[PDB]
Symmetry: none
Subunit: 101 residues, 2 copies
């Protein structure tokens, strides 16, 4: 069973929202599913606004369905790479509220 999900989102191409605004959308999208913005910030562990626009998070399969239909949500994929050495989606890391360089 898949416990970790890649949520791919879409943003208006013009004018394009800023990196910060995209990340805020991710967190608000997770917060909607999880219950709270604080849960979201402690859950999400990776994301992108460049190589792709989406984020990675941990929910059970049934809950991952709640992402479909939410504004901006495009595609809900299982995270194959969270635990594979030397493979990733080309994303950035996010740890408990802080973007990692």
């Amino acid at each position: 069973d898949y416990n970790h999900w890649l949520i791919v989102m879409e943003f208006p191409k013009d004018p394009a929202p800023s990196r910060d605004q995209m990340i805020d959308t991710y967190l608000n999208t997770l917060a909607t599913v999880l219950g709270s913005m604080e849960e979201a910030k402690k859950n999400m562990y990776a994301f992108s606004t460049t190589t792709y626009t989406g984020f990675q998070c941990t929910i059970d399969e049934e809950t991952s369905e709640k992402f479909k239909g939410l504004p901006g949500v495009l595609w809900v994929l299982p995270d194959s790479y969270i635990d594979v050495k030397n493979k990733d989606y080309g994303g950035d890391k996010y740890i408990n509220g802080e973007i990692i360089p």
Copy 2:
């Protein structure tokens, strides 16, 4: 045993390509990696144009790296669902030239 891949692709949005053109691109992209359109058509077993944008296929890991040099290839992911009952990506099936309705 065998390695099964979801190849995720991206297409321009203005103008957008047609379904037929995307499917052709999947087969072209696979054919380039394989070195044969004939092999590509026997190999590819599923794809999407709606629910997602990409296709599934069976090659070894080394050969699958050839996709990453090709235009439109975003991710080269392991197929998560090919051997899992009652779970799939929602893609359409493709069988030796037949798009399966």
